[PDB]
């Protein structure tokens, strides 16, 4: 859990929501890729973003990711009630395993 995320991010429906993920510069994000998951409690997770730049197959266009040397982030356009779940970032390389961060919760205002 060397990667850290804000405990929560809030916004109104239809609002853009952005989730940051950061860590030690040896971990994030040089020579590393970030994947982003939805992980509702009591249920299997769904993967939204690969390589911190691309939507996974079956994923709606409202989701996108951005990358920088110091940090990476997930942005959710058009926030909907269905998106009010726990999210996790993960660092990975082609030669190493997944390292999950602390995670965050998205909250809908209203």
């Amino acid at each position: 859990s060397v990667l850290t995320q804000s405990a929560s991010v809030s916004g109104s429906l239809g609002q853009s929501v952005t989730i940051s993920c950061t860590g030690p510069n040896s971990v994030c994000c040089s020579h590393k890729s970030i994947s982003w998951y939805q992980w509702p409690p009591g249920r299997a997770p769904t993967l939204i973003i690969y390589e911190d730049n691309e939507r996974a197959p079956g994923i709606s266009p409202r989701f996108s990711g951005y990358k920088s040397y110091w940090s990476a982030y997930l942005t959710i356009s058009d926030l909907r009630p269905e998106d009010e779940t726990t999210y996790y970032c993960c660092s990975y390389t082609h030669n190493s395993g997944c390292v999950f961060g602390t995670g965050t919760k998205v909250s809908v205002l209203g």
Partner: protein, 130 residues
Amino acid sequence: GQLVQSGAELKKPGASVKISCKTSGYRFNFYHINWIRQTAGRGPEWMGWISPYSGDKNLAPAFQDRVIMTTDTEVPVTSFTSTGAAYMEIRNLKFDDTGTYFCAKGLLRDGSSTWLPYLWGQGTLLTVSS
């Protein structure tokens, strides 16, 4: 594409547990199998993966001394579909090993992210008690 896991089981400390993961609807040998664990005090953690094709394994140091992975030989259904199963055994269980265990299908062949999970089983619970 679907994965099915062994149901929840109660264990005594120091006991080993084996969890099966039956698969269907896709070629078993074409994708990595990822074992993922979730514990309330730790969150999700990667336990490692095994290739069904080569038998090659990549485990975190945390699990290298405790976890053994193996797979069944695939049985074909169509030229592009097969069935089979993955198994994992955890030795010397501790109370810290309690949590939900998931089996997941690898994303793709020949990519930069081949072993990342894409499809997940529902997952099942492991409990440890005196």
